[PDB]
Amino acid sequence: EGLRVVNLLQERNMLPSTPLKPPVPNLHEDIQKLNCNPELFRCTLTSIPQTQALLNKAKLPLGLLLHPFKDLVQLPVVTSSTIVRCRSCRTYINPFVSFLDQRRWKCNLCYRVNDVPEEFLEPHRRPEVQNATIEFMAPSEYMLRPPQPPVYLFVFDVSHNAVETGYLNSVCQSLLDNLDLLPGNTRTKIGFITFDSTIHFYGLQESLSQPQMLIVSDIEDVFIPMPENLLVNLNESKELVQDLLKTLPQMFTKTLETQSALGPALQAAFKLMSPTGGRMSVFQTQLPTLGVGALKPREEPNHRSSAKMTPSTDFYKKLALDCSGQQVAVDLFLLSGQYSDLASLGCISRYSAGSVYYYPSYHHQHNPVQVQKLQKELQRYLTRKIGFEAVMRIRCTKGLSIHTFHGNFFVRSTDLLSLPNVNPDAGYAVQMSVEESLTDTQLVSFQSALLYTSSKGERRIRVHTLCLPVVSTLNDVFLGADVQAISGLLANMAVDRSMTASLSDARDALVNAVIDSLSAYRSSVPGLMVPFSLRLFPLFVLALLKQKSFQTGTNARLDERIFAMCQVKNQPLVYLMLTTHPSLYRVDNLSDEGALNISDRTIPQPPILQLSVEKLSRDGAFLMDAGSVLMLWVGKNCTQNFLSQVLGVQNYASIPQPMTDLPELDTPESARIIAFISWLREQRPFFPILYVIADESPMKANFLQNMIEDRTESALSYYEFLLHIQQQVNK
């Protein structure tokens, strides 16, 4: 623990060797123990300021981060013959209610007292009050219509360039491989659409020898060509769809089509699903240039261009809002080797609760890395759970108010987050403020509710509730500050600042949060002093400032930057942190101080290293865990033992250029390293690819762009940053 003050200018080794853990609200024992899991729900300030004035003085953003549909190990599912909910604010009977008349409960959000119905009976022993996370079975009035069936619509771009990337094969291959794993019962419907300068529908009838490629060429007046076999029943037509998946790849080899009419294609896609809603998977490979939705080419910046982001058209935004209203979500797969204006395309996913996936310069032969990455991202994509036609709401105790939402969705009337689809990998953030002084209360609560239709046609409500203590002291607010959560909430904020103003402003606002918070701190207590809880605040922000999302002097391209922002906006806190500030470990010398508890596996636990090239060593090997991928950097003067016993090579010179993964050798060293890597991968459900390719000369050493602590020709070093902060803090 420690309520101690820290001087960032003297330590310079603050970063711990063990993974950071989320703070623990300063609550009584019995309450904290029922609190919601922090990987699911969390707050920037575990100690809620009592007044807006107090909040403002601390100069720290107040907000919540959430991962509502996260895969869980054990989920309490109540099938209650009635959902107990406060009669005023409609909050769900939770563990933080005040039971008094043991036949009357005090709602912890609006204080009103309610009656416990003769069905809820020791009413306090009920599951709804012994669990912060729980799933309810929605009664008939929680659905505007019969549970929609699961509907998947794959829309593939088949332009000349698309054909040249050769992605269609793997996509089709993955679909075949995972046809039976797609969430859903016998009601599942699947469909397919390809497109170039025209829209290509595909009918599937058991009575016919082969699938019909129905082509509509009227780009300004799209329409569904047939009424019965375009969205077929997977269960009954499994065979029919399997031939198609084996046929498509071989269909456009000789194509001469050069233009892509993504706009019209999506509108056609829309009309086909409009009736049931569902999930539309779009795979695009280039700038759209035909028909409505057309986008002009743009010239890529360079390390020379200043900080002088937003969509060039609203077509895709308008379209998404339409998809949203029909319970249609759109996931975007961009595998482009040239600018494609993702800044405008992304809109199709942001506002429809979809998500975008980016595979820069994807090529079946030339880019082995993007190939395996797509494979594994499709694996998770195609097999993770899914919820349909959903909505979510976040309620907070009176006095507190949410004023800004972050994430892919559409906000109906304040806090009626519309979610056509809801996936287990999406994260969300919220910004609140104290509208009414919490003088009355000493504890506040937050409750989010996810109303959706399962892949099995069942309306369900998953609920999470977080309880936190209220404090009236600047010192108490800082003691509870969650440095990572603040980092995350600031990124979301910064992204909007980018779109809303400029990248410069966004970058300043970021640096100001650190400066103003620390400055406020100092004016309330020689070197840069900060409380323990914020000892990593400048580090994580600097990291945030050097990321592909906000970095400047770099040679980063448009789509990459935007894709990075798309991730800040949709990714759960942890992945945001693993990406911005990747975990670095030395791995050519692992040993036994690990989790050698796991029955027959040891699992070394090497210490975490700070992201500086000064922690490296030309005699070792370093692994960097950046969440989505794992890069293993090998030193030029690495030991022979690691070359042959781990890499399987006899000398550094022969370490294969692109190396997609480690070989599994019959060697203790290999077993130790494979063990560590495999454990890392088990800590997430999105198999991260690994690549050693980071040689000392593979011109792929983009392992370094992460040593966020060193100085670049166009970036301050960690130490310089501290120097600049201190100059401002006590100006």
């Binding site: 929680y142 909505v391 509710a449």
Partner: peptide, 7 residues
Amino acid sequence: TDIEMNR
């Protein structure tokens, strides 16, 4: 009258 409410 939104859906997840009931009032």
